């Protein structure tokens, strides 16, 4: 089961966020249009890790986490009225963000 992230309740979200569109995103560091993560602190849009089997992205989201320490990201294309896929770099797991609606509203995302 996905547990509540310890970061969720008091997550920092930076002022002057981008309006994140409902489709058509790309990694800001490469050509990936699949497997994109929206960082819930800064609204960066970056691709997922390269898996050891050769699958996945080009590690741009994790590289960004190593620089910023911003732990929570939502997988774009998984946001629905029932929730979303939220990952914590810090806890290294998929997690629950009980403030997800609020976190997404920051970026002009109405999950409903
Ligand atoms: O790829 C990224 O940068 C962010 C998403 C991500 N990194 N690792 C995982 C993971 C780890 C444990 C369980 C399930 C998924 O997901
Ligand atoms: Zn990338």
Curated annotation (Swiss-Prot):
A zinc finger (UBP-type) spans 3-111. It is found in: Cytoplasm; Cytoplasm, Stress granule; Nucleus. Ubiquitinated by SMURF1; leading to proteasomal degradation. Substrate binds at residues 37, 49-52, 87, 89, 92. Zn(2+) binds at residues 27, 30, 47, 60. Homodimer. Interacts with TRIML1. The UBP-type zinc finger domain crystallizes as a dimer linked by a disulfide bond between the Cys-23 residues of both molecules, but there is no evidence that the full-length USP5 exists as a dimer. Belongs to the peptidase C19 family. The UBP-type zinc finger domain interacts selectively with an unmodified C-terminus of the proximal ubiquitin. Both UBA domains are involved in polyubiquitin recognition. Deubiquitinating enzyme that participates in a wide range of cellular processes by specifically cleaving isopeptide bonds between ubiquitin and substrate proteins or ubiquitin itself. Affects thereby important cellular signaling pathways such as NF-kappa-B, Wnt/beta-catenin, and cytokine production by regulating ubiquitin-dependent protein degradation. Participates in the activation of the Wnt signaling pathway by promoting FOXM1 deubiquitination and stabilization that induces the recruitment of beta-catenin to Wnt target gene promoter. This is Ubiquitin carboxyl-terminal hydrolase 5. It comes from Homo sapiens. The gene is USP5.
